[PDB]
Amino acid sequence: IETVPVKLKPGMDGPKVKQWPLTEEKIKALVEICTEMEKEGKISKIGPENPYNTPVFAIKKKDSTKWRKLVDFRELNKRTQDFWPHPAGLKKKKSVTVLDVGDAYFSVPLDEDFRKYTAFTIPSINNETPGIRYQYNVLPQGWKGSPAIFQSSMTKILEPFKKQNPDIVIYQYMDDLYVGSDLEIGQHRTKIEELRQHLLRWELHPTVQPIVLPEKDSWTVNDIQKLVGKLNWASQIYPGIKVRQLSKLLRGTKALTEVIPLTEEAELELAENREILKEPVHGVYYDPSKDLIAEIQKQGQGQWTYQIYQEPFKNLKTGKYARMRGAHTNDVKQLTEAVQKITTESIVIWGKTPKFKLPIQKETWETWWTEYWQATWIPEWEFVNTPPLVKLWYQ
């Protein structure tokens, strides 16, 4: 009912970001939604005296044929002064369910002085009419300050539920509310409905994957060459990996498909390498003061591999996505879904989103990514233009 004073970081002006082109149906959906939001006083139209603009587009979440308004708050979030609680037990919980609490944010009024920075623009087709401009009178979804401000309120809402059973972990990131537990999915569903109506009144399944080497009865020259390449690669990550007895098999010059029988010393070397690989990595820690880097490799056939790390050859997490949902004919759709899942997991585990490095040209991604995007948050990303040799090594 009262607006907590909010400013920006020292020496930083408000965000000015070009609104990118929108399709017709998205423009229409935004027009309808923003009209209805205007009627409810959530947002108000503004004049030219406001230089600031933040991008906006429209999406569709699954099970919903109704549009949702997605604001890209990245630059504004970066330009807000750091606002001054992470449950490491959330990742340990057997199951975690995600909720959208965004409807609750619109009750809290936004600081009047700060409202000028939340300005956005519904664009028009072919620049025939000037864009419709709005500013938020309440806490906007996607803004980093919104959960921080509603944090206390949310605590007040969750006091009875949390006090009632404290075997249930509750976390909050942006517009999303994550709830972990050990319960059964039926009882979990009933409990989540209980918390849902509890919200009325006022599905995930959570290690760094081991580097594996083939087990073969007979090795070709090619097999051993790939093995040596993978082991040499892994030697960066692991201290004691030695390829010298395996390389001694390749000695002479033979056809790639010719079978080379393993020697005693070579088999021993491979075994020792296996044992070394079975251990975890030496001295791997998570520095909260460092960036999270995510790298994704397209493996083909819907397969994707990823690694989250703060330092080269020290991996905080690794994973693989074969998941097939409506994505078969479309690479970019798959990539977007993968980025979303990796980001979600990153949010659960470390509390924050990773900086992505994407195996896609900038222009392609820039063109098509918003069409497949169902998340309320957005991460940062990079584009790698040089094909990695590590592709085969993470397969």
Q: Which residues are annotated as a binding site for Mg(2+)?
A: 100, 175-176
Rounded to a whole number of angstroms, the minimum distance from the CB of residue 160 to another protein is 46
Instruction: Please give the Cα distance from 124 to 132 (Å, whole number).
Output: 8
Question: Which of 251, 264, 289, 312 is the binder for another protein (CB under 8 A)?
Answer: 251
Q: 86: which 2 tokens?
A: 């992470």
d(CA 291, CA 379) in angstroms, rounded, equals 12
Site for another protein in 38-67 (CB under 8 A): 47-53
- Integer CA distances (angstroms), 2 to 43, 139, 166, 251, 352, in order: 17, 12, 31, 78, 28
Residue 34 touches another protein, criterion: CB under 8 A: no
Under the binding rule (CB under 8 A), the answer on residue 320 touching another protein is no
- Least separation in angstroms between residue 387's CB and another protein is 4
CA distances from 183 to 84, 99, 166, 193 (A): 33, 17, 13, 14
Give the residues across from 296 on adjacent strands.
306
Q: How far is the CB of 78 from another protein (least distance, A)?
A: 19
Question: Is residue 389 part of the contact set for another protein (CB under 8 A)?
Answer: yes
Interface residue with another protein among 3, 95, 97, 225 (CB under 8 A) is 225
Task: Assess contact for 174 and 147: CB atoms under 8 A.
Answer: yes
232 binds another protein (CB under 8 A): yes
Residue 229 makes contact with another protein by CB under 8 A: yes
Asked whether position 91 contacts another protein by CB under 8 A, the answer is no
Tell me the C-alpha to C-alpha distance, in Å, between residue 241 and each of 218, 223, 226, 266, 356.
22, 18, 15, 13, 30
CA distances from 308 to 74, 231, 350 (A): 21, 21, 11
Nearest by Cα to 344 from 314, 310, 378, 320: 378
CA 142 – CA 144 distance, rounded (Å):
6
Q: Which is nearer to another protein, 161 or 233 (CB)?
A: 233
Q: How near is the Cβ of 57 to another protein at its closest, in Å? A: 12
Stretch that binds another protein, among 88-96, 101-109, 265-273, 357-365 (CB under 8 A): 357-365
Residue 254 found at the interface with another protein (CB under 8 A): yes
Query: Could you tell me the smallest distance in angstroms from the CB atom of residue 233 to another protein?
Result: 8
Q: Which residues are annotated as a binding site?
A: 100, 175-176
The span of 88-96, 137-145, 245-253, 270-278 binding another protein (CB under 8 A) equals: 245-253
SS3 179: strand
Q: What is the DSSP string of 2-18?
A: ------B-TT----B-P
Give the total of residues touching another protein (CB under 8 A): 62
Contacts with another protein, residue ranges (CB under 8 A): 16, 21-24, 27, 47-53, 125-130, 133, 220-222, 225, 228-229, 232, 243-244, 247-258, 298, 300, 330-335, 358-361, 363-364, 367-368, 386-389, 391
